PDB file of N, CA and C in Angstrom:
ATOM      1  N   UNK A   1       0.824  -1.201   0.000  1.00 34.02           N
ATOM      2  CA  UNK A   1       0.000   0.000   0.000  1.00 34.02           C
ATOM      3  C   UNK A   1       0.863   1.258   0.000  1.00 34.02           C
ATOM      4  N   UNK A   2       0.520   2.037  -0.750  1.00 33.31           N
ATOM      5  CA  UNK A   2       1.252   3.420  -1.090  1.00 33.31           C
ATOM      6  C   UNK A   2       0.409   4.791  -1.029  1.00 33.31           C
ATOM      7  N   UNK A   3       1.049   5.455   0.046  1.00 30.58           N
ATOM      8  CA  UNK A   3       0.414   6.755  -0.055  1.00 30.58           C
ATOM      9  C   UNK A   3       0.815   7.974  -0.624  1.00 30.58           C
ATOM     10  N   UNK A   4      -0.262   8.880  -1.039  1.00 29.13           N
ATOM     11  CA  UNK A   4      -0.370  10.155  -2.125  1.00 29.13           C
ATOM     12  C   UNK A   4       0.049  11.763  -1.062  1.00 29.13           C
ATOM     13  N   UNK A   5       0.516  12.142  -1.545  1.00 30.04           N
ATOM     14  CA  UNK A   5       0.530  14.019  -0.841  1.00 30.04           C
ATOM     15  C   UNK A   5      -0.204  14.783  -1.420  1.00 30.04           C
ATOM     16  N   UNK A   6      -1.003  15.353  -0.301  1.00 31.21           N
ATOM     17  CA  UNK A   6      -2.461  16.178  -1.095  1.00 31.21           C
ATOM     18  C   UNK A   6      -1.979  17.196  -1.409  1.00 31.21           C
ATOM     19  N   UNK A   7      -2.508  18.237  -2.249  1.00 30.44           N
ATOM     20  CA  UNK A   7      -2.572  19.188  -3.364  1.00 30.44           C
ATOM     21  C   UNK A   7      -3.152  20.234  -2.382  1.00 30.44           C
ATOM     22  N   UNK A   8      -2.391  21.127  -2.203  1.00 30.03           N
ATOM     23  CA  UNK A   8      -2.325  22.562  -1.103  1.00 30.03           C
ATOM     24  C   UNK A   8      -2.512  23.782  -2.731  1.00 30.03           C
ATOM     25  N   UNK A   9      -3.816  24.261  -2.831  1.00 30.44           N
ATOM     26  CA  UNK A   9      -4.002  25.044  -3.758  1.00 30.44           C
ATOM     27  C   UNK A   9      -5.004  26.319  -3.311  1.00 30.44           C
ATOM     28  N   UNK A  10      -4.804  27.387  -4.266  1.00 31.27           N
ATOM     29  CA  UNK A  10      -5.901  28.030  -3.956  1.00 31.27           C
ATOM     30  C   UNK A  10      -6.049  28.965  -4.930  1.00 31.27           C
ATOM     31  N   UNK A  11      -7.333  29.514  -4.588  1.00 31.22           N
ATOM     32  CA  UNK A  11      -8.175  30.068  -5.701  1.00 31.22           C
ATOM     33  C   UNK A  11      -9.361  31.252  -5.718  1.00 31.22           C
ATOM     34  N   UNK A  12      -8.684  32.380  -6.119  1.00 31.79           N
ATOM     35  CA  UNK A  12      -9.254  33.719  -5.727  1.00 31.79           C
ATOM     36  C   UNK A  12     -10.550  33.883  -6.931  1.00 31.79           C
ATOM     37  N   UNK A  13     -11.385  35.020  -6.264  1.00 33.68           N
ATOM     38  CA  UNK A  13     -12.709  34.886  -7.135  1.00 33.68           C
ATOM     39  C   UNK A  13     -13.221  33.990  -7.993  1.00 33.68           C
ATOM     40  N   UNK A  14     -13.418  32.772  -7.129  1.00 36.19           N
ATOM     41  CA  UNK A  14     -14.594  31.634  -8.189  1.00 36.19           C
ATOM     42  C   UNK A  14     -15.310  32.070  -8.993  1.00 36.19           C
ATOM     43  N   UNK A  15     -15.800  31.159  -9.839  1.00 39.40           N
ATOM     44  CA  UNK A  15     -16.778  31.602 -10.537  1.00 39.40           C
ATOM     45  C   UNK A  15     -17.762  30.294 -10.510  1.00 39.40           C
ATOM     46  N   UNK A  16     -17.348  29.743  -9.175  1.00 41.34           N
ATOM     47  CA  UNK A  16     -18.330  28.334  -9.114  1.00 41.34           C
ATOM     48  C   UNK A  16     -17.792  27.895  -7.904  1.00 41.34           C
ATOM     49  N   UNK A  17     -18.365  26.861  -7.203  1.00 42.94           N
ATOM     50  CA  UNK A  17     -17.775  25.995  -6.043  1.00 42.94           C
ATOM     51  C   UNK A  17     -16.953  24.692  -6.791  1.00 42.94           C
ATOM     52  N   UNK A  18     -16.276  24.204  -6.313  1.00 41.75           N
ATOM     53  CA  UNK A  18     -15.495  22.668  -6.277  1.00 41.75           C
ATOM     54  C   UNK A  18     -16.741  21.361  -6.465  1.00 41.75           C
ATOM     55  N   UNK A  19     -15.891  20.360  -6.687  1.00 40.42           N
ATOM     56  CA  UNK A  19     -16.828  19.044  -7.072  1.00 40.42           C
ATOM     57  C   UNK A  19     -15.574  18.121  -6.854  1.00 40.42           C
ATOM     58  N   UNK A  20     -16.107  16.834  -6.508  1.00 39.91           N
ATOM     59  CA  UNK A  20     -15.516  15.704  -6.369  1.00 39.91           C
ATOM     60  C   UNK A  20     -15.061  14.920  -7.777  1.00 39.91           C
ATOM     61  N   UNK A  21     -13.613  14.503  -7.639  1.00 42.79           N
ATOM     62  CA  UNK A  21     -13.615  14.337  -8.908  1.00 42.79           C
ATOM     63  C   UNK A  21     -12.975  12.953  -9.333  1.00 42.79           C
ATOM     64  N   UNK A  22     -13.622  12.075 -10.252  1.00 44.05           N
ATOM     65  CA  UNK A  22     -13.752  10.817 -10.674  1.00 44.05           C
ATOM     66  C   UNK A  22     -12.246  10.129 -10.645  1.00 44.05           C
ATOM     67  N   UNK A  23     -10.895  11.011 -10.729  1.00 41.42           N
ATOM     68  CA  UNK A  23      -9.690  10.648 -10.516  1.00 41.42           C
ATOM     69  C   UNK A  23      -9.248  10.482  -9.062  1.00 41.42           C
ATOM     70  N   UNK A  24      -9.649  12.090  -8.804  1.00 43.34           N
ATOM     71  CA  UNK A  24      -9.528  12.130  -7.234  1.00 43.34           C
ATOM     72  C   UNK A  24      -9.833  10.803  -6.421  1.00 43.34           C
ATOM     73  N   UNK A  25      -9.880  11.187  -5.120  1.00 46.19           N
ATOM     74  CA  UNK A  25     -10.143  10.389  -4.015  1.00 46.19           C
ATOM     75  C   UNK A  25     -11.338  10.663  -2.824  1.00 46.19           C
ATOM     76  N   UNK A  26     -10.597  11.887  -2.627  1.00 43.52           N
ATOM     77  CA  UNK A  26     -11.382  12.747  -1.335  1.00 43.52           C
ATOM     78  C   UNK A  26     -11.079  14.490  -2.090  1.00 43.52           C
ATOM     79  N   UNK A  27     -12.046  14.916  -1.333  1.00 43.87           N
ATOM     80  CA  UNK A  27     -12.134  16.371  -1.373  1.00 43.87           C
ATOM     81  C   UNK A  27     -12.370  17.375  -0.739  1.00 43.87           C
ATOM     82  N   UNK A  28     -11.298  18.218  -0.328  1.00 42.85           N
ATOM     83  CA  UNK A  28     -11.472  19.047   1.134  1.00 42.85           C
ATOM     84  C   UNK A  28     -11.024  20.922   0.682  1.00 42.85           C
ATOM     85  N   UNK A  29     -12.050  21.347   0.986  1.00 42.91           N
ATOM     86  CA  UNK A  29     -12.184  22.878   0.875  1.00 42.91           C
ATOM     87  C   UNK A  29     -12.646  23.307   1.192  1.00 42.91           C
ATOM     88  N   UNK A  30     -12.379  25.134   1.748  1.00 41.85           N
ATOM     89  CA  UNK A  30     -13.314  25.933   2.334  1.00 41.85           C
ATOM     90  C   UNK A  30     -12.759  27.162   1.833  1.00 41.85           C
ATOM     91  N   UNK A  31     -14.023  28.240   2.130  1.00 41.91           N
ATOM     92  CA  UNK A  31     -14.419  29.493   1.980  1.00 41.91           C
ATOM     93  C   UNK A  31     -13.609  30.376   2.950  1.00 41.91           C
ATOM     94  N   UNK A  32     -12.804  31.753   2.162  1.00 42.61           N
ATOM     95  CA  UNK A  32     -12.018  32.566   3.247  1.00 42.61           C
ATOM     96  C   UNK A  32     -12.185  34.128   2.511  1.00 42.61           C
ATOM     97  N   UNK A  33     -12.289  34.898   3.933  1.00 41.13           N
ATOM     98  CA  UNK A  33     -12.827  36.121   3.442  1.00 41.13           C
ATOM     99  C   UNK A  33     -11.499  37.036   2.743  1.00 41.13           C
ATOM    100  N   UNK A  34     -11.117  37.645   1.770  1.00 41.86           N
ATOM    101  CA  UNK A  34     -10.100  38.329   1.266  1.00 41.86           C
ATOM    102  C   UNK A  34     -10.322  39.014   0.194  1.00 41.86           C
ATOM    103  N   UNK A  35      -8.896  39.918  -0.360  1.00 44.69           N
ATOM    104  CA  UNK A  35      -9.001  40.304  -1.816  1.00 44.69           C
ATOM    105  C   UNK A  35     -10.631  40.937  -2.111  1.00 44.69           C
ATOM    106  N   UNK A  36     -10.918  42.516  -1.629  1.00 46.28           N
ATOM    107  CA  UNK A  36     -11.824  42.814  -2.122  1.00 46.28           C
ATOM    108  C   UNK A  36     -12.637  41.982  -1.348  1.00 46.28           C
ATOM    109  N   UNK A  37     -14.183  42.074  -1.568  1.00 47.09           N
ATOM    110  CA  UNK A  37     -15.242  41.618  -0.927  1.00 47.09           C
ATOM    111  C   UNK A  37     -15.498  40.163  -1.450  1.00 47.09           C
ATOM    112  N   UNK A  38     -14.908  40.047  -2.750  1.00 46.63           N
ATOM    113  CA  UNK A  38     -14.945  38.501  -2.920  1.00 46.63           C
ATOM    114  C   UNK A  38     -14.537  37.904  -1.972  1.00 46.63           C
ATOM    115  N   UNK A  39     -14.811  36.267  -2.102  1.00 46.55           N
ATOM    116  CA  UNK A  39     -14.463  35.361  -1.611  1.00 46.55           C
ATOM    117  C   UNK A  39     -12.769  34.645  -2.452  1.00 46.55           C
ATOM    118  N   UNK A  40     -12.325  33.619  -1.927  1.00 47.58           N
ATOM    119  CA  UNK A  40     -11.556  32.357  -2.629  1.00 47.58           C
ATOM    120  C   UNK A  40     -11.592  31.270  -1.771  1.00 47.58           C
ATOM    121  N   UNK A  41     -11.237  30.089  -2.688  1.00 45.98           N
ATOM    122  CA  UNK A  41     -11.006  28.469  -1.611  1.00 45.98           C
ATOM    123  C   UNK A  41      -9.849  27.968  -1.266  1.00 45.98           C
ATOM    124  N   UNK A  42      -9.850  27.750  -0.071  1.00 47.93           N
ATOM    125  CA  UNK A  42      -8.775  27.031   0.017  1.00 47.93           C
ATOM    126  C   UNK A  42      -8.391  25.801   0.768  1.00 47.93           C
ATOM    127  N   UNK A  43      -7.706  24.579   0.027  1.00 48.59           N
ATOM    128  CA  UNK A  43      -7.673  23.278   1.135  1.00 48.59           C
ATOM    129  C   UNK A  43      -6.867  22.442   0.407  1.00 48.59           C
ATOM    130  N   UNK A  44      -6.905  20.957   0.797  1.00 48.19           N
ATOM    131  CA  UNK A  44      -6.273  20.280  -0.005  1.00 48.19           C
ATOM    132  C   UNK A  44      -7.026  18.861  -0.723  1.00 48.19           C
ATOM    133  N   UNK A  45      -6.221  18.657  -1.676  1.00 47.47           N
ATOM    134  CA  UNK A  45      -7.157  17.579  -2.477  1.00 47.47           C
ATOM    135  C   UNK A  45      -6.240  16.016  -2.809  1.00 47.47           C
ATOM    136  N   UNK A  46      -6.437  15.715  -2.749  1.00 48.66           N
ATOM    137  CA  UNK A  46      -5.624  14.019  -3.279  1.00 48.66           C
ATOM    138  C   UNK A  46      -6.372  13.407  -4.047  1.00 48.66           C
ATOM    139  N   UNK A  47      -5.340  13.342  -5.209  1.00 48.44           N
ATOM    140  CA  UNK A  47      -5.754  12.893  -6.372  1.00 48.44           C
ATOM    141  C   UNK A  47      -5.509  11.047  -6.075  1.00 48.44           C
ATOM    142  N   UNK A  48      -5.790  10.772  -7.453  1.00 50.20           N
ATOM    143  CA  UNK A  48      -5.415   9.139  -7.620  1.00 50.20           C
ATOM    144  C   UNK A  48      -4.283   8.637  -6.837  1.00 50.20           C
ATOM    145  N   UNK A  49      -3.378   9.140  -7.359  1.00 54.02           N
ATOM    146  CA  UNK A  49      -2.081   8.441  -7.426  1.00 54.02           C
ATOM    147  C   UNK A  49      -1.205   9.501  -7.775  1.00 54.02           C
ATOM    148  N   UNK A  50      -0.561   8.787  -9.457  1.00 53.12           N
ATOM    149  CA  UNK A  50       0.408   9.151 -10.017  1.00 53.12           C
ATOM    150  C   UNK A  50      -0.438  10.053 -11.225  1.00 53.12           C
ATOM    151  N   UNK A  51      -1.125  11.332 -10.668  1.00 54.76           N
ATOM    152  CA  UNK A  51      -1.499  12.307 -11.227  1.00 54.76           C
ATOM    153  C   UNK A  51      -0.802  13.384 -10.838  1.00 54.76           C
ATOM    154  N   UNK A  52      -0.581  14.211 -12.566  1.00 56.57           N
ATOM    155  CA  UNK A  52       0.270  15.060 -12.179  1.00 56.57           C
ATOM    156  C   UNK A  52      -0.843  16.484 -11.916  1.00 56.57           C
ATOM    157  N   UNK A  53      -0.194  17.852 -12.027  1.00 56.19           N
ATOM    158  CA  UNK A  53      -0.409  18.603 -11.565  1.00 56.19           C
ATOM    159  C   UNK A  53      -2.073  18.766 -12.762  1.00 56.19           C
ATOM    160  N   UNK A  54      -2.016  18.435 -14.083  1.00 55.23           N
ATOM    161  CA  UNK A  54      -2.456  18.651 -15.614  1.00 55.23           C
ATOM    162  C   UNK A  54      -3.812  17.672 -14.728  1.00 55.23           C
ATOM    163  N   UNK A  55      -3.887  16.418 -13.839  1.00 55.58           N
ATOM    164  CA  UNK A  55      -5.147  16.146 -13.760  1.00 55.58           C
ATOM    165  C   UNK A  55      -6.016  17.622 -12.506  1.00 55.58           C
ATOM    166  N   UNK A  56      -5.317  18.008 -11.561  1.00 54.46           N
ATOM    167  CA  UNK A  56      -6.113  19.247 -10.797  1.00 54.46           C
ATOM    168  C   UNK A  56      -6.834  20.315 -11.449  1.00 54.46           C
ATOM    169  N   UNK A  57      -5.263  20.999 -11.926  1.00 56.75           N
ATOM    170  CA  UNK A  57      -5.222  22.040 -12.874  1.00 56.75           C
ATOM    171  C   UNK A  57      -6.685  21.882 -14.150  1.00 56.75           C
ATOM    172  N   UNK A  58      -7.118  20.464 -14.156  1.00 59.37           N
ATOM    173  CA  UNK A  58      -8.198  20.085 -15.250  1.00 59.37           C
ATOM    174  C   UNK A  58      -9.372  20.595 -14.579  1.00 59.37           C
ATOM    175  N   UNK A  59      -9.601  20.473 -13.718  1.00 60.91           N
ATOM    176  CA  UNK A  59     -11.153  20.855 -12.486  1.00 60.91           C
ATOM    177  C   UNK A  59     -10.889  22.511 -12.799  1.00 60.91           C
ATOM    178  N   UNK A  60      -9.830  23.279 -12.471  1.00 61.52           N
ATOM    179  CA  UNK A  60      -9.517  24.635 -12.335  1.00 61.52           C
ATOM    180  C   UNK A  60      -8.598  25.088 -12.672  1.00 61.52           C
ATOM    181  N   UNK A  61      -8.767  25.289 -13.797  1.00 61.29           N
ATOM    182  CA  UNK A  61      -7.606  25.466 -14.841  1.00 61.29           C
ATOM    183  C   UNK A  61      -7.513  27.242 -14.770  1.00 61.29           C
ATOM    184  N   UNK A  62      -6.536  27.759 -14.059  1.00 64.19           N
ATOM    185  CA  UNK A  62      -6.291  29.534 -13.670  1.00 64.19           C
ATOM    186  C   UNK A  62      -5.983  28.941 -12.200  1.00 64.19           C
ATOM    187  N   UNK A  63      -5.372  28.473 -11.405  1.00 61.97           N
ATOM    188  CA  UNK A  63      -5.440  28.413 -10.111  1.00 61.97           C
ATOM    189  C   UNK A  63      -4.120  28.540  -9.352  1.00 61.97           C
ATOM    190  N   UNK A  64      -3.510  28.705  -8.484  1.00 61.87           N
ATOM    191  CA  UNK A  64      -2.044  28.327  -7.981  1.00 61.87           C
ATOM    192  C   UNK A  64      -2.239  27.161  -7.152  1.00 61.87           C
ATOM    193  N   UNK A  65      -1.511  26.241  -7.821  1.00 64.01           N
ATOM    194  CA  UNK A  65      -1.004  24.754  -6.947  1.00 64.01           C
ATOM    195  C   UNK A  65       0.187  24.509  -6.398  1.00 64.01           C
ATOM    196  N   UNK A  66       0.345  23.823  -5.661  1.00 63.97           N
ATOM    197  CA  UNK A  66       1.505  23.074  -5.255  1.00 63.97           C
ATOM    198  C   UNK A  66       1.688  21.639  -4.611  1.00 63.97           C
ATOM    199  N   UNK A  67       2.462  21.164  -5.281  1.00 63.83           N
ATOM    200  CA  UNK A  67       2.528  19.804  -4.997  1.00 63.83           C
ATOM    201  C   UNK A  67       3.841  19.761  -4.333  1.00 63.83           C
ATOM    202  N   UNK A  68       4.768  20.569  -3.750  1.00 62.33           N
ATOM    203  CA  UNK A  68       5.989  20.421  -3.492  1.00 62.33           C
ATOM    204  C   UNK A  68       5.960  19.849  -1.712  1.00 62.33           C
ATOM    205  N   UNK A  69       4.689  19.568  -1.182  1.00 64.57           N
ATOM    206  CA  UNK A  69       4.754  19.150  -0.158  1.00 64.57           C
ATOM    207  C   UNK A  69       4.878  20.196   0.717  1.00 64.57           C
ATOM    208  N   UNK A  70       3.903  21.467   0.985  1.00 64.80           N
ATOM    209  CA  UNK A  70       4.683  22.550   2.048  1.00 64.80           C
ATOM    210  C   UNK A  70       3.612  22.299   3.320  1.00 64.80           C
ATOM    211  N   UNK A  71       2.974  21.352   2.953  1.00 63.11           N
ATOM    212  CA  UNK A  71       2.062  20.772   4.381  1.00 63.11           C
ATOM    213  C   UNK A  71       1.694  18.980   4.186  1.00 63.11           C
ATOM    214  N   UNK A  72       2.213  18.247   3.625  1.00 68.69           N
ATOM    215  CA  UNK A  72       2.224  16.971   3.659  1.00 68.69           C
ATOM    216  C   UNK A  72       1.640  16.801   4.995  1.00 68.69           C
ATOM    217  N   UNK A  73       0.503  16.172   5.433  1.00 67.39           N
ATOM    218  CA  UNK A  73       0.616  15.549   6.939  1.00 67.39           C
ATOM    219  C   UNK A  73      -0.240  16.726   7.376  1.00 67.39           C
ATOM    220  N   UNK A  74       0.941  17.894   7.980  1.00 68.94           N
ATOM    221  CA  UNK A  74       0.756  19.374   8.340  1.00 68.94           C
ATOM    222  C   UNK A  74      -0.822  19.918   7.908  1.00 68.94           C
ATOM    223  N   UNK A  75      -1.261  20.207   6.958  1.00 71.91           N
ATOM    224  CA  UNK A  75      -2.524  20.499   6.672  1.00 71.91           C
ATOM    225  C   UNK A  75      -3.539  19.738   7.140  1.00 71.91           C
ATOM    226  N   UNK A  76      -3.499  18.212   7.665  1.00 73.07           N
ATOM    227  CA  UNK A  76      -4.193  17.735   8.185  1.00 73.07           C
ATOM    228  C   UNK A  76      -5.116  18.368   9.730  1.00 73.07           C
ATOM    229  N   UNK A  77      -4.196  19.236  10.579  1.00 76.04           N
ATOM    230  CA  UNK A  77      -4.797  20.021  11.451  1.00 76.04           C
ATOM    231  C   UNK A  77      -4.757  21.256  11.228  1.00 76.04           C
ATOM    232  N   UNK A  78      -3.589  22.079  10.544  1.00 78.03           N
ATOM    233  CA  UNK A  78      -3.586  23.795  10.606  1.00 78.03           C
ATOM    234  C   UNK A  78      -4.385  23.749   8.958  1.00 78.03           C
ATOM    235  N   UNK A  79      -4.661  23.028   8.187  1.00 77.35           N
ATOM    236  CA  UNK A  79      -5.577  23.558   7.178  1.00 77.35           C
ATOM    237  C   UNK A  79      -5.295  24.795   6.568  1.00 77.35           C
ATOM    238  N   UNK A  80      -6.258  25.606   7.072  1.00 74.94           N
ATOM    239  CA  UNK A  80      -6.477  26.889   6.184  1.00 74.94           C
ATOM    240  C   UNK A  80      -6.361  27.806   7.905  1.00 74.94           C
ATOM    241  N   UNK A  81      -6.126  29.638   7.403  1.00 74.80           N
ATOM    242  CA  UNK A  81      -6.304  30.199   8.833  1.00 74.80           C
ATOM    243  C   UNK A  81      -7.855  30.405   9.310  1.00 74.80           C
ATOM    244  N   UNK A  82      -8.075  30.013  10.539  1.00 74.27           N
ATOM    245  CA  UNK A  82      -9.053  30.299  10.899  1.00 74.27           C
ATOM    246  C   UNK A  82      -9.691  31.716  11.249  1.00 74.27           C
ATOM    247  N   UNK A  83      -8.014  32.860  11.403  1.00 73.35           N
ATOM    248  CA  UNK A  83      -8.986  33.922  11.941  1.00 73.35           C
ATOM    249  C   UNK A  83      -9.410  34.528  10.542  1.00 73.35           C
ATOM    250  N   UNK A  84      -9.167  34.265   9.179  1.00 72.66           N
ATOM    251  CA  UNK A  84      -9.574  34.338   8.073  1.00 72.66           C
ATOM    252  C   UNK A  84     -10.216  33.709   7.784  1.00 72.66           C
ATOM    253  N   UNK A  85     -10.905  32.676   8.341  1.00 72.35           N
ATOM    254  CA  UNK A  85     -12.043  31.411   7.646  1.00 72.35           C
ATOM    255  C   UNK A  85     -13.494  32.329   7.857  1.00 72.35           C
ATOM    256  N   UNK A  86     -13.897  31.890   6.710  1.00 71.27           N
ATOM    257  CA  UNK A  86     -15.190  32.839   5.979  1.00 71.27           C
ATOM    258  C   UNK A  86     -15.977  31.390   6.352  1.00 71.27           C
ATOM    259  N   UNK A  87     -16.084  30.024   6.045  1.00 72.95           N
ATOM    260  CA  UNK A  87     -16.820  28.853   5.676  1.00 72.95           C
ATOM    261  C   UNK A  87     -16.101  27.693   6.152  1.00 72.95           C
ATOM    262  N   UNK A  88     -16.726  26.811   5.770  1.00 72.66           N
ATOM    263  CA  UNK A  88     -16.312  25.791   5.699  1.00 72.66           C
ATOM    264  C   UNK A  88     -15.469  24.898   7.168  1.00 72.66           C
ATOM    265  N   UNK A  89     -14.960  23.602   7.476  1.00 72.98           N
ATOM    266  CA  UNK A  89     -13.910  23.568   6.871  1.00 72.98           C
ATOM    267  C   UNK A  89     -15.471  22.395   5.792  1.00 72.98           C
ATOM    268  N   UNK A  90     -15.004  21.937   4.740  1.00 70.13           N
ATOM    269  CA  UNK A  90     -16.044  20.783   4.018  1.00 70.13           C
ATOM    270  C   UNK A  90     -15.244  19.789   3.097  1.00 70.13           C
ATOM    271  N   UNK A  91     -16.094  18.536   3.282  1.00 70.11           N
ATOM    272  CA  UNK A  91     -15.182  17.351   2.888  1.00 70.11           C
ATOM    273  C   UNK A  91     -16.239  16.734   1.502  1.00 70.11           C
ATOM    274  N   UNK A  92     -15.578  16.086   0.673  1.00 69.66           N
ATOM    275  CA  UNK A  92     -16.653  15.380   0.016  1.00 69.66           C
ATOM    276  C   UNK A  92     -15.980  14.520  -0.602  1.00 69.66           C
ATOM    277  N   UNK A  93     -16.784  13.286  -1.198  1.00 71.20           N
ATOM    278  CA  UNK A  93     -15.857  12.037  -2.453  1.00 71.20           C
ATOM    279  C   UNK A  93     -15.744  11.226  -0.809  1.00 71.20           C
ATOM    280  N   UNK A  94     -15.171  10.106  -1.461  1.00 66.94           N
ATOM    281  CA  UNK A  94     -15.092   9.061  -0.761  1.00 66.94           C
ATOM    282  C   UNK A  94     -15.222   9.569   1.016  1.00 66.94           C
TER     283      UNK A  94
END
């Protein structure tokens, strides 16, 4: 058994919410207040496997990702900031 490092991304003025996605696995994001009165999301996602950045980037293609691991593990409790959390935290997919 082999494990994946989730996808620490985020994403200023949506123009839609997130969806669970058929490669993916699980799906974790929330709502934070910034930038102007808009909103953006932010959390992490784990894909399949051996998906590269081209399967995320496919859901939200304009976004900043990182896969370089800057919360492997770590995001599991500090997430996103809370005294900035607008929503969420929300899980979906498996």
């Amino acid at each position: 058994a082999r494990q994946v490092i989730c996808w620490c991304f985020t994403l200023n003025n949506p123009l839609s919410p997130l969806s669970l996605h058929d490669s993916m696995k699980y799906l974790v994001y929330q709502t934070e207040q910034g930038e102007a009165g808009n909103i953006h999301f932010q959390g992490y996602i784990e894909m399949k496997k051996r998906t590269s950045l081209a399967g995320m980037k496919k859901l939200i293609p304009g976004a900043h990702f990182e896969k370089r691991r800057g919360t492997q593990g770590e995001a599991r409790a500090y997430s996103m900031k809370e005294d900035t959390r607008l929503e969420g935290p929300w899980e979906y997919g498996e």
